[PDB]
Structure formats: structure tokens, C-alpha cells
Amino acid sequence: SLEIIGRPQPGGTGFQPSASPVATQIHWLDGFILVIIAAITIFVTLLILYAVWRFHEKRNKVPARFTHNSPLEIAWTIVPIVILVAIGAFSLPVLFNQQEIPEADVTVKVTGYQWYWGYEYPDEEISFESYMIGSPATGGDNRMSPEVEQQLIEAGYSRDEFLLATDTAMVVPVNKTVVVQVTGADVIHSWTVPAFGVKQDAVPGRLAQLWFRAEREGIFFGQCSELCGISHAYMPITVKVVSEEAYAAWLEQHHHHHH
Amino acid sequence: RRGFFTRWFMSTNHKDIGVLYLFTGGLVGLISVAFTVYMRMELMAPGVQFMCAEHLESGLVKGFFQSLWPSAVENCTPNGHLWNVMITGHGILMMFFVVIPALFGGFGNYFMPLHIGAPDMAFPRMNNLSYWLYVAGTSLAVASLFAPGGNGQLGSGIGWVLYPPLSTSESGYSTDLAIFAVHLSGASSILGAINMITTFLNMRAPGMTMHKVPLFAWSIFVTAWLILLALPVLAGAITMLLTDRNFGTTFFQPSGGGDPVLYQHILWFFGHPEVYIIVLPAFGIVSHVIATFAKKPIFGYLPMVYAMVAIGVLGFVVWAHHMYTAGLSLTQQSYFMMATMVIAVPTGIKIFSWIATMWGGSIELKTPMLWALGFLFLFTVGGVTGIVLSQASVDRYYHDTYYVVAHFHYVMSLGAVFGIFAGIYFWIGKMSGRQYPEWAGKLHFWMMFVGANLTFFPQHFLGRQGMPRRYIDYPEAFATWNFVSSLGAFLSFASFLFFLGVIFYTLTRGARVTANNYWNEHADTLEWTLTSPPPEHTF
Numbered sequence: 001s002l003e004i005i006g007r008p009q010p011g012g013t014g015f016q017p018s019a020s021p022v023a024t025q026i027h028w029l030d031g032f033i034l035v036i037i038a039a040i041t042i043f044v045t046l047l048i049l050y051a052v053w054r055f056h057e058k059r060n061k062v063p064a065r066f067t068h069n070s071p072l073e074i075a076w077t078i079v080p081i082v083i084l085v086a087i088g089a090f091s092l093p094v095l096f097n098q099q100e101i102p103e104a105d106v107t108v109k110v111t112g113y114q115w116y117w118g119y120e121y122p123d124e125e126i127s128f129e130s131y132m133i134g135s136p137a138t139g140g141d142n143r144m145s146p147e148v149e150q151q152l153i154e155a156g157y158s159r160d161e162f163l164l165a166t167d168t169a170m171v172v173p174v175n176k177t178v179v180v181q182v183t184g185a186d187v188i189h190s191w192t193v194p195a196f197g198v199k200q201d202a203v204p205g206r207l208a209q210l211w212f213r214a215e216r217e218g219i220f221f222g223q224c225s226e227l228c229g230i231s232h233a234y235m236p237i238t239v240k241v242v243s244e245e246a247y248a249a250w251l252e253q254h255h256h257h258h259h
Numbered sequence: 260r261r262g263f264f265t266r267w268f269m270s271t272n273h274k275d276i277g278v279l280y281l282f283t284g285g286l287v288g289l290i291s292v293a294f295t296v297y298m299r300m301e302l303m304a305p306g307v308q309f310m311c312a313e314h315l316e317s318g319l320v321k322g323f324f325q326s327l328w329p330s331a332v333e334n335c336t337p338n339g340h341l342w343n344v345m346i347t348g349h350g351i352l353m354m355f356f357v358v359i360p361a362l363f364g365g366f367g368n369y370f371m372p373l374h375i376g377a378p379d380m381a382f383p384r385m386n387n388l389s390y391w392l393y394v395a396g397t398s399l400a401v402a403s404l405f406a407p408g409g410n411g412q413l414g415s416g417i418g419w420v421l422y423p424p425l426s427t428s429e430s431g432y433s434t435d436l437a438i439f440a441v442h443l444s445g446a447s448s449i450l451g452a453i454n455m456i457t458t459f460l461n462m463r464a465p466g467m468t469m470h471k472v473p474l475f476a477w478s479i480f481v482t483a484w485l486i487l488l489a490l491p492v493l494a495g496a497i498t499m500l501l502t503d504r505n506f507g508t509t510f511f512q513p514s515g516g517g518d519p520v521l522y523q524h525i526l527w528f529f530g531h532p533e534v535y536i537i538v539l540p541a542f543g544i545v546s547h548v549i550a551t552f553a554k555k556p557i558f559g560y561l562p563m564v565y566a567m568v569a570i571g572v573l574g575f576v577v578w579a580h581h582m583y584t585a586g587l588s589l590t591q592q593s594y595f596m597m598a599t600m601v602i603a604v605p606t607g608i609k610i611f612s613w614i615a616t617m618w619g620g621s622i623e624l625k626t627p628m629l630w631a632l633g634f635l636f637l638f639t640v641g642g643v644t645g646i647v648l649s650q651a652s653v654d655r656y657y658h659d660t661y662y663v664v665a666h667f668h669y670v671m672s673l674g675a676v677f678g679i680f681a682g683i684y685f686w687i688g689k690m691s692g693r694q695y696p697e698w699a700g701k702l703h704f705w706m707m708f709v710g711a712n713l714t715f716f717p718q719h720f721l722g723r724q725g726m727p728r729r730y731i732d733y734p735e736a737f738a739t740w741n742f743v744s745s746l747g748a749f750l751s752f753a754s755f756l757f758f759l760g761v762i763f764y765t766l767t768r769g770a771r772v773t774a775n776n777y778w779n780e781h782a783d784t785l786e787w788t789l790t791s792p793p794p795e796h797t798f
């Protein structure tokens with residue numbers, strides 16, 4: 001079966017695994033910025049703790065009177081500027097790569113509804129809706145139950161994927177450029193998949209684009225990311241990334257043969 | 260002679276109005292903090308155990324008490340609307356009715372005139388009206404919670420920023436009440452701002468030149484300008500929501516030719532300045548406090564003034580960093596990213612200047628100083644995660660997750676709020692005539708320090724793991740850090756109840772203040788030359 005990859009893990013402190021070149025760039029850039037901001041924070045903290053230890057009233061009974069130090073005041077304006085410029089230098093190329101939409105191998109149009117997602121593959125004339133396993137649409141009321149657990153198991157999951165798993169998945173071929181066009185039907189929703197490094201608001205009246213190329217097969221989950229009412233917590237996203245051949249098989253399963 | 264209502268609520272004196280804003284801000288603070296305890300009760304464990312739809316069929320009172328005890332999942336039908344209402348209530352109360360009234364309306368009204376040698380505000384009756392508009396706004400925000408709202412229940416579950424079409428489609432009139440509350444808060448802030456500006460410019464004491472004005476009064480002056488530009492823009496944004504809801508307009512409705520994203524631009528044009536309006540008066544307080552307890556004058560007085568001015572101005576040209584995923588062009592994203600990054604420079608000047616103020620001093624670790632030192636460290640933690648978030652490429656991942664929540668609670672609840680406590684402990688002797696017990700101030704500090712860090716630091720982890728904002732429930736893998744966060748919230752709440760006990764004791768049994776200046780000679784601003792409490796009519 002498919003490996004569950006794009007999901008949170010117990011006690012996790014880092015990003016979800018990367019499954020796209022874009023997600024990998026985010027991981028690298030955030031790792032870079034984190035080292036810098038940790039250094040800064042540790043620096044500021046050590047300076048404070050030192051000053052308190054060194055110039056505590058029981059140690060230094062006579063305070064100084066200076067209110068200026070030009071060499072230092074220049075250095076602590078200029079150095080933050082350099083650091084920010086360094087961050088920008090690495091950050092802008094990543095941003096440009098994220099937001100420049102390449103040519104699509106697969107095109108999917110996604111619509112956010114209260115409270116579920118609709119998917120259309122215009123090249124394939126496929127259209128379907130995707131509800132949380134446990135949603136009222138599937139007979140539930142947004143909580144775990146013996147039926148919901150059985151439903152999760154039948155669909156290839158476990159009770160651990162509750163709130164992530166949907167009844168239908170957006171299926172795509174591995175190593176192909178997928179362009180997703182996102183809009184909202186009623187209020188604003190937001191479509192995202194952490195493993196791919198993508199997120200785009202689903203705004204009524206607007207069609208926005210994002211892209212990803214998945215680099216391994218498996219199952220990847222996201223969750224609606226703009227508050228949209230009572231079931232905001234209960235309209236997740238499942239993307240299954242499969243072989244070119246398994247993707248065709250899934251397309252044919254949707255093909256109607258009317259005479 | 261004067262009854263309690265006349266003595267206090269009818270007073271037009273800046274010191275009395277200041278005290279009214281402080282107590283009220285503290286009371287609304289307690290309410291909003293209580294909401295968060297309940298929030299964190301529900302987030303302690305995956306599955307919904309408290310916010311059950313079954314509690315709606317009982318009364319309002321018995322339904323309330325039922326809500327506080329955990330149910331089995333199989334007996335609890337999740338009610339996402341209650342979650343959304345609590346979250347919205349907590350946020351609106353904090354942002355409009357707690358921290359700014361405490362810092363600007365409270366310490367601002369009290370100390371700014373004292374600091375510049377003014378006997379009162381330019382318009383004392385306007386100042387009194389500002390307070391009443393504040394209370395009226397608070398009353399409406401609170402009333403919205405019990406008014407017909409979304410999903411055939413009570414209350415608005417729309418987020419503190421009221422995004423349409425959600426906010427314009429929410430059923431009932433609870434949302435309209437929240438809009439009116441925000442209008443009344445806005446008016447309150449504008450009236451306050453008119454007073455601060457007129458007083459600061461026209462009523463300084465003989466010899467009190469602009470470059471001799473103390474830093475807190477500067478912080479209040481800068482804050483008032485931001486209010487004048489930011490708050491009328493908000494009044495526009497929300498009036499448009501009200502007309503889309505009630506008067507047939509389609510500003511944000513695509514069917515009528517509108518655009519939901521237009522609201523966001525107008526909203527965040529207020530929404531970013533809003534947070535600098537919050538934190539500037541806290542910068543001011545920290546300056547006075549560090550200088551006093553390091554027994555050393557403030558390092559770089561003029562850069563300190565100009566840094567706050569630069570922060571205030573820059574705060575107006577960065578708003579779309581709240582909109583990176585809302586459909587902004589790559590050009591807009593790049594600009595707003597780079598503009599936002601610039602803010603770290605003047606802010607760093609202040610952080611470094613405060614450390615340089617301590618440097619070579621004679622540092623006394625009294626309670627007010629502990630709060631200021633905590634501020635330096637904790638506001639830095641929050642500020643740097645702000646810079647992370649300004650990177651649109653990384654924000655793609657973090658936006659609408661708990662990493663953002665971690666960011667803003669570090670700068671607000673471990674920053675601005677540490678500023679509030681710094682000021683309270685610094686000035687309670689001066690305002691009341693009674694001093695707080697030192698050991699209890701210190702216990703408060705340490706309980707809050709440990710508790711608030713346990714609450715919010717793990718939210719960074721939750722955000723990196725991809726936990727979204729505004730969720731009643733979450734996937735099981737998020738259990739560990741949610742549980743830790745909740746324990747932190749409960750300890751933090753204990754510290755706050757303790758604090759309220761400290762204030763009660765102080766004001767009833769606290770050692771009487773016997774000196775105009777009960778600190779030291781480096782508390783060198785005008786309030787320290789007056790009695791404790793200052794006379795009814797000063798100067």
C-alpha cells in the first residue's frame with residue numbers, strides 16, 4: 001500500500017517530511033534563519049545575564065554615567081542590516097521559485113465549500129467532492145466512533161489518521177508538475193499540504209494558482225487553513241501520489257462509458 | 260462627601276481616569292484570560308470533551324457548569340461554534356478592551372501629564388467620555404456573546420479580524436454588536452489620542468523642551484499619532500461589513516462585484532499599526548524602569564525617541580505580510596517582506612540601548628526590574644519569530660498555524676503584558692500610597708515566567724508540525740505539546756489569581772509609602788517629586 005508520509009508525528013518539533021523541491025527549500029531556508037535567530041537570541045540573553053551578574057548592586061555599588069558610545073551604536077545598526085540583507089539574499093530566490101508557476105503536467109481545480117473540498121481535473125473531465133471521514137456527509141458527527149474507525153481502516157488508514165483522512169483523495173502521478181487552481185464557493189477557505197510546502201487561500205471570486213512536484217509516492221495530508229465557520233476543523237485534504245500507471249488506473253476508474 | 264460613583268466614574272481628572280482604565284482593563288483582562296483557561300482545557304487532549312452540543316439543551320447557567328466538566332467523546336457531540344466564539348471573544352477583548360486601555364488609557368492618562376508637568380489633559384471632559392465609550396464598547400462585545408449569532412446559536416465565531424464573506428454571512432445580529440463595540444473602542448482611542456497630542460504639544464511645563472521630555476511621554480505621543488491614522492481606517496472597514504450585512508451593499512461580495520481581499524487590505528492597514536499601538540507604551544515603561552533599577556540614565560535618549568518614531572512610521576507600510584497566502588502578486592510579496600524586515604533595525608537599537616543602560620550600572624533586582632528584564636529576553640524571542648514570518652517563502656508553511664500564535668503571544672503576553680506588570684509594580688506605591696510586598700511580586704514574576712513560557716514555547720513545535728489556528732480539535736500526533744501548553748496556561752492562570760490577591764492586599768494592608776520617591780534618585784521624573792498619591796490638583 002501507500003506509505004503515510006505527510007502527517008504530524010507524536011511529540012514532533014520539526015517540519016513534516018519534505019516531498020517536493022519547494023518544501024526542501026523551505027526546510028533549508030528556515031534552518032538557516034533558525035541558526036541566525038537562535039544565535040541572536042542567545043547573544044541577547046547572555047548579554048543580559050552577564051550584565052546582571054557583573055553589575056548587580058552587591059558587586060558594583062557605584063553606577064557609571066555614560067549615555068553614548070558611537071563605535072558601538074554604529075556597529076549595532078550596521079550588523080543587523082547585514083544579517084537582514086544576508087537573509088533576504090537567500091529568501092527571495094526561494095520565494096520566486098515558489099511563486100513562478102511552471103508548465104502543468106497535471107492540472108487540478110480545487111474549490112472550498114462549507115465544509116468540504118471539490119476537485120476537478122479539466123483535462124480528464126473528472127469531478128468529485130472530498131469529505132472528512134467522520135463528517136456528517138459520511139454518516140458521522142466529527143468525532144471518533146467504532147463506525148469512523150472501521151471507515152478509516154477500509155479506506156487504508158487507521159484511527160491515528162482521524163481528522164486528516166478524507167473519503168476521496170486527490171490522486172496525482174509522482175515526479176510530475178501539478179498546477180492547482182484554488183477558489184472558494186462561499187467563504188474563504190485555505191488549501192494546503194505541509195509536505196509539499198504549499199498553501200493558498202480559497203477566496204470566492206478569485207482563482208489562485210500554486211504548484212508542486214511530488215518526489216516520492218505516498219499519502220500526504222493538509223487541513224483547511226482559513227477559519228470558515230463551524231466545521232473549519234473538519235474539512236481536511238488528502239493527496240495520494242502514485243506511479244504514472246496507477247494514476248492512469250485511477251483516471252479510468254472514473255471514466256464513464258455511455259452508449 | 261462624594262459617593263463612590265461620583266468620586267471615581269464622574270471624575271474628569273487624568274489620574275482618576277487613568278486608575279479607572281487600569282482597573283477596568285484588569286477586569287476585562289481577567290475575563291479574557293478565563294476564556295483561555297477553558298480554551299486550554301479543551302486543547303489539553305485530542306477529542307472534544309468540554310464543548311459538547313449536548314450542553315445547549317440545558318439552561319444558560321446549568322449548561323455553563325456542565326461545560327466545565329469533561330465528557331466521554333461518545334457522549335460529546337463536538338460544537339465548533341462555541342470554540343470559534345471563545346477564540347473570537349478572547350481576541351477581541353484583548354486587542355480592543357484590555358492591553359491598550361491599560362497602557363495608553365491607564366498609565367498614559369495617569370503619567371504622561373505628570374511627566375511633562377501638565378496639571379491635566381487639554382480636554383478633561385472629553386477624557387472622561389473616552390472612558391465611558393470604552394465601557395460601552397466592552398459591554399457590547401460582552402453582549403455579542405449572548406446574542407443570536409452563527410449557526411443558530413449565540414455569539415460570533417468569526418475571528419477577531421472579522422474576514423468576509425464569513426463575517427458578512429454569519430447569522431443573527433451578534434456580529435453587528437461586535438462591530439458596534441469596535442466602533443466604540445475606536446472612538447475611545449481617538450478621543451484619548453486627541454487629548455494626548457494636544458496636551459503634549461501645548462501644555463508642557465516652562466523649560467520642558469521636546470528633547471527633555473521623558474521617554475514614556477514620547478512613547479504615548481507617538482502611539483497617539485498611530486491611533487489617529489489607523490483607527491478611522493478600521494471604522495471604514497467595519498462600516499463596510501455592516502453595510503454588506505444590513506444595507507444591501509456588496510463591497511466584499513463577488514456576486515455583486517466585490518472582493519473579499521479588499522477588506523483584508525483595509526483591515527490590516529489598521530491591524531499592523533494596532534500592534535505598535537500596543538507595544539510602544541510598553542517600550543516607554545521599560546525605559547523608565549531599567550534606568551531606575553540600573554541606577555543609570557537611559558543610554559541613547561535621542562535614538563530611543565527616533566527609533567519609536569521610525570517603528571511607528573514603518574508600521575504603516577507593512578500590512579500585507581498578513582496576506583502572503585491571500586493572492587498577492589510576487590512583486591507585492593517581495594516588497595512587503597523587505598519593508599517588514601527593516602523594522603528589526605530600530606527595534607534592535609532599543610534592545611541594545613536597554614542592555615547598554617544596564618551596562619556599568621548598580622543593578623537592583625526588585626520586582627519591576629524582573630518584569631523589564633523578562634521583557635528584553637521574551638520580546639526578543641517573539642520579535643525574531645516575527646522576522647521568520649516576514650519571509651513569505653517560510654510563511655507559506657507557517658501562516659494560519661500555531662507558530663504565528665506562538666509569535667504573537669511572545670510579543671503580547673510575554674512582552675506588552677510584562678510591560679504592564681512592570682508599570683504596575685513600579686507605580687502602585689505612587690498611585691495608591693501603599694507599597695506591594697516584595698516577596699509576592701517576585702513569586703508572581705517567577706510563576707508567570709515559567710507558566711507563560713510553558714504555555715507558548717511548545718506552540719512553535721505545534722506550528723512546525725502543521726497545527727492550524729482556530730481548531731476545536733486536532734490530530735492525535737499533536738497531543739504532547741498541546742498538553743504541555745495547557746499545563747503552562749493553568750500555572751499562568753494561578754499566577755494571575757495570585758497577582759490579583761497581591762493587589763488586593765497591597766491596596767488594603769500594604770505598607771504605607773512615606774516618601775515622594777520610594778525608589779532612588781535615578782527615578783528622576785516629575786511624579787517622583789510629588790506625594791504618594793499625588794494631590795488632587797497637581798502643579
Ligand code: HEA
Nearest residue numbers: 080534538580603606607642643645646648649658667670
Ligand atoms: C505586541 C504586538 C506585536 C508586535 C510588537 C509584533 C511585531 C512584529 N511582527 Fe507580529 N503579530 C502580532 C503581534 C505583534 N507583532 C499579532 C497579534 C499577529 C497575528 C494577527 C492575526 O492574524 O490574528 C502577528 C502576526 C505577524 C505576521 C503575519 C503572520 C501570519 O499570519 O502568517 C507577521 C509577518 O511578517 C509578523 C511580523 C512581525 C515583525 C517582523 C515584528 C517586528 O516588529 C519585531 C521586531 C523585533 C525584533 C526583530 C527583536 C529585537 C531586535 C533585535 C535583537 C535586533 C537584531 C534582530 C535581527 C537582525 C532579526 N507578525
Ligand code: HEA
Nearest residue numbers: 285288295350353361418419671672728729730748751755
Ligand atoms: C494582549 C493580547 C493577548 C494575550 C495577553 C493573550 C493571552 C493568552 N492567550 Fe491569546 N490570543 C490573542 C491575544 C492575546 N492572548 C489573540 C488576538 C488571539 C487571536 C484570536 C483569533 O484567532 O481570532 C489569541 C489566540 C489565542 C489562542 C489560539 C486560539 C485558536 O487559534 O484556536 C490560544 C491558544 O491556546 C490563546 C491562548 C492564550 C492564553 C493561554 C493566554 C493567557 O492565559 C496567558 C497567560 C497570561 C496571563 C495570566 C496574564 C494576562 C494579563 C493581562 C491580559 C493584563 C491585564 C491588565 C492589567 C493587569 C491592567 N490565545
Ligand SMILES: CCCCCCCCCCO[C@@H]1O[C@H](CO)[C@@H](O[C@H]2O[C@H](CO)[C@@H](O)[C@H](O)[C@H]2O)[C@H](O)[C@H]1O
Nearest residue numbers: 308311313314325326328329330331332333334335336
Ligand atoms: C447493573 C446496573 C444497571 C443499572 C443501570 C442504571 C444506571 C445507569 C446510569 C448510567 O450512568 C450515567 O453515565 C453518564 C455518562 O457517563 C452520566 O452522565 C454525566 O457524565 C457524562 C460524561 O460522559 C456527561 O456527558 C453527561 O452530560 C453527564 O450527565 C450519568 O450521570 C450517569 O448516571
Ligand SMILES: CCCCCCCCCCO[C@@H]1O[C@H](CO)[C@@H](O[C@H]2O[C@H](CO)[C@@H](O)[C@H](O)[C@H]2O)[C@H](O)[C@H]1O
Nearest residue numbers: 296300301303304305306308329330331332749752753
Ligand atoms: C488554577 C486553574 C486550574 C484550571 C483547571 C484545570 C482543569 C483540568 C482538568 C481536566 O480534566 C481532564 O480532562 C481530560 C480531557 O481533556 C481527561 O482526559 C481523559 O478523558 C477523556 C474523556 O473525557 C478522553 O477522551 C481522554 O483521552 C483521556 O485522556 C481527563 O480524564 C480529565 O481529568
Ligand SMILES: CCCCCCCCCCCCC
Nearest residue numbers: 013014015037041640643719
Ligand atoms: C528539526 C527541528 C527541531 C528544532 C525545533 C526548534 C524550533 C523552535 C523555533 C522557536 C524559535 C525560538 C527563537
Ligand SMILES: CCCCCCCCCCCCC
Nearest residue numbers: 696699756757759760761764
Ligand atoms: C509581607 C506580608 C505578606 C502578605 C501576603 C500577601 C499576598 C496575597 C496572596 C493572595 C492570594 C490569593 C489567591
Ligand SMILES: [Ca+2]
Nearest residue numbers: 301304306307
Ligand atoms: Ca479536547
Ligand SMILES: [Cu+2]
Nearest residue numbers: 189224228232
Ligand atoms: Cu474551510
Ligand SMILES: [Cu+2]
Nearest residue numbers: 224226228232
Ligand atoms: Cu476552514
Ligand SMILES: [Cu+2]
Nearest residue numbers: 530531578581
Ligand atoms: Cu503585522
Ligand SMILES: [Mg+2]
Nearest residue numbers: 225226658659
Ligand atoms: Mg489566513
Ligand SMILES: [O-]
Nearest residue numbers: 530531532534
Ligand atoms: O502585526
